[PDB]
Design an enzyme around this catalytic site. Structure first.
Site, short mmCIF file in Angstrom:
data_model
loop_
_atom_site.label_atom_id
_atom_site.label_comp_id
_atom_site.label_asym_id
_atom_site.label_seq_id
_atom_site.Cartn_x
_atom_site.Cartn_y
_atom_site.Cartn_z
N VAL A 88 -7.16 -9.26 6.32
CA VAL A 88 -8.12 -8.79 7.91
C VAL A 88 -8.23 -7.40 7.81
CG1 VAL A 88 -6.47 -10.76 8.35
CG2 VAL A 88 -5.71 -7.72 8.31
N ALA A 110 -9.10 0.28 7.99
CA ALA A 110 -9.91 1.31 8.33
C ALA A 110 -8.73 2.64 8.62
CB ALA A 110 -10.63 1.45 9.58
N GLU A 151 -5.37 20.41 9.20
CA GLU A 151 -6.08 18.69 10.07
C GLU A 151 -4.63 18.85 10.37
OE1 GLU A 151 -7.71 15.67 8.20
OE2 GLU A 151 -8.07 14.96 9.77
N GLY A 173 -2.89 4.49 10.08
CA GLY A 173 -1.49 4.39 9.59
C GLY A 173 -1.48 4.62 7.80
N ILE A 174 -2.96 4.61 7.22
CA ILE A 174 -2.95 5.04 5.95
C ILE A 174 -2.85 6.74 5.85
CG2 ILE A 174 -3.80 5.61 3.77
CD1 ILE A 174 -3.63 2.98 3.42
N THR A 227 0.59 -1.31 0.43
CA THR A 227 0.36 0.22 0.10
C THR A 227 0.91 1.25 0.10
OG1 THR A 227 -1.95 -1.04 1.42
CG2 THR A 227 -1.85 1.36 1.21
N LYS A 281 -17.58 4.28 6.79
CA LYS A 281 -16.51 4.34 8.72
C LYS A 281 -17.33 5.47 8.47
CE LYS A 281 -12.84 4.66 11.22
NZ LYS A 281 -11.13 5.08 11.95
N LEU A 315 5.48 1.67 7.36
CA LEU A 315 5.44 0.68 7.95
C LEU A 315 7.22 1.04 8.63
CD1 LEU A 315 3.79 -2.42 8.84
CD2 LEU A 315 3.08 -0.54 9.14
#
Length: 521
Positions: free
Chosen positions: A41, A44, A454, A354-355, A14, A73, A342
């Site tokens: 798995v 989000a 943000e 994470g994203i 990703t 979500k 990561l």
């Protein structure tokens, strides 16, 4: 002519294909980009992803969501963080109500320059209402309980939302976009060695077929291995397991009969005996993973606790068993090597950042993009922005465990013994004194519309109240100025009656999340 001409990206997940897609769109013909690439798995996200990333590529939600079984979500739903007991999927009963609270995405209205949260705390102090913070202030809570979509079927917007998807299908989608539409070169194979000049700068990546992938700038998206930033460049990792104790996960995906109880339009974070479990629902299936601390649970213990909650046969179930690395590099960018994803840093996905850390790194890279002289001020600025963003969410995540009242297992008790950072101790004290924490200063559409808006105030007053009040922590007293503005308190009550009107209306007219997903897929 000191422009970067060639970029080489190591890693084809990703992070790798988001980096390649965005950089290629940002730089066009001026730079050659090459990527070296060697159970779902669920994943989000947070609401800015469309505006920051997919809109930059020109990809509408109607296009990319069907390509990766994406779903909606509206919040994170925190289950059983206040009551003791086993790791179980449905909320326990605390004083008449289920033990759950929502952390949604909408910004709180203000009245008289005071956020709606502070009128809720005033009413609770006055003893006139017993309603939980999230149900009094957020219309989204009633929609999520009724498993509503965040939009009407024809696209009419209703509530702020983000996405659930299978991250592998997203990377495959972006690989196809990057290579077929943005002239990114995909190179299969393993990296043989890292070539470095007499000043420690990387000159080329050498594949096992003897090919030298030469470039001026190198992006490390190799995951936890950190092949360039940690191995070659020798940048040390800062382990932060002294603040966040979970370091393991066991995860799978479960087929789901959506016609029985719908598709939940939210991520669940389900408190367990030695950690917490995520639930990421999509059409036809949900991803789920128990995140736990090996210092407090054995591997088989966690596996069986996880399988027991979902009624899975542990001996006949495919399970991802992963140990992870909680912390960040001392520097995310060293010389001409930038770590993304990561390879750069990791936190447990308690708030789905994470994203966000990936797109943030990519955006900030283009904001600090170098030339071949690699002025230190560019990487120093980049590293500071990455370090500030990570530490701020790390601290936020730790407060989820620190403020929880649970003491029934050694894990939940040991969280209350960890050192609380001074900035978070100050925040809890402001909260207890009735002050807002990082009150938003922009409207919602601009907030998720301008990245730097943000990025400066990523966790705002609404979010701290969602966590602190949801976990049972209320101010010692309402905001003192409200004692001087009684007419504002009387006026503000119409805002609570407005939320109640909107809760009824959203439940009565919105389509189900299931209905929208079937329309979309």
């Amino acid at each position: 002519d000191n422009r970067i001409n060639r970029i080489v990206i190591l890693g084809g997940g990703t992070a790798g294909w988001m980096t390649a897609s965005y950089l290629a769109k940002a730089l066009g013909d001026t730079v050659t980009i090459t990527l070296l690439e060697a159970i779902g798995v669920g994943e989000a996200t947070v609401p800015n992803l469309q505006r920051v990333f997919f809109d930059f590529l020109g990809l509408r939600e109607e296009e990319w969501m069907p390509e990766c079984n994406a779903a909606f979500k509206t919040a994170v739903k925190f289950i059983n963080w206040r009551t003791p007991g086993p790791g179980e999927a449905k909320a326990r009963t605390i004083d008449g109500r289920p033990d759950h609270f929502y952390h949604p995405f909408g910004l709180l209205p203000e009245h008289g320059q005071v956020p709606l949260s502070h009128y809720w705390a005033y009413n609770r102090a006055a003893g006139t209402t017993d309603e939980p913070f999230d149900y009094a202030c957020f219309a989204e809570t009633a929609a999520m309980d009724a498993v509503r979509a965040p939009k009407w079927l024809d696209g009419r917007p209703a509530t702020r939302y983000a996405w659930h998807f299978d991250a592998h299908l997203v990377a495959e989608f972006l690989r196809r976009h990057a290579t077929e539409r943005l002239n990114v070169e995909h190179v299969q194979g393993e990296m043989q060695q890292v070539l470095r000049d007499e000043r420690g700068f990387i000159t080329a990546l050498r594949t096992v077929e003897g090919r030298d992938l030469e470039g001026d700038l190198f992006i490390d998206c190799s995951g936890f291995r950190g092949l360039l930033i940690n191995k070659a460049m020798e940048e040390p990792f800062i382990d932060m397991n002294d603040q966040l104790l979970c370091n393991r996960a066991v995860a799978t995906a479960i087929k789901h009969d959506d016609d029985a109880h719908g598709v939940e339009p939210y991520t669940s974070a389900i408190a367990m005996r030695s950690g917490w479990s995520w639930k990421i629902p999509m059409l036809g299936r949900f991803g789920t993973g128990y995140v736990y601390s090996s210092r407090f649970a054995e591997k088989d213990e966690a596996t069986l606790d996880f399988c027991r909650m979902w009624g899975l046969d542990p001996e006949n179930t495919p399970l991802n068993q992963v140990a992870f690395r909680v912390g960040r590099n001392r520097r995310a960018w060293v010389k001409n090597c930038v770590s993304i994803g990561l390879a750069s840093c990791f936190l447990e996905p308690l708030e789905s950042t994470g994203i966000y850390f990936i797109t943030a790194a990519i955006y900030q890279l283009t904001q600090h993009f170098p030339d071949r002289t690699f002025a230190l001020a560019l990487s120093d600025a980049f590293n500071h922005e990455i370090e500030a963003m990570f530490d701020d969410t790390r601290d936020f995540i730790q407060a989820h465990f620190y403020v929880s009242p649970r003491t029934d297992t050694p894990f939940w008790k040991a969280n209350k013994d960890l050192h609380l950072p001074e900035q978070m101790r100050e925040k809890i004290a402001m909260y207890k004194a009735g002050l807002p924490i990082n009150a938003p200063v922009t409207d919602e559409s601009t907030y998720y519309g301008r990245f730097e808006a943000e990025f400066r105030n990523f966790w705002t007053n609404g979010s701290y109240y969602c966590i602190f009040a949801g976990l049972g922590l209320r101010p010692d007293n309402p905001l003192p100025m409200l004692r001087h503005r009684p007419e504002q308190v009387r006026e503000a009550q119409a805002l609570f009656a407005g939320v109640k009107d909107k809760q009824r209306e959203l439940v009565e007219t919105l389509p189900s999340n299931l209905e929208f997903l079937r329309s979309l897929h």
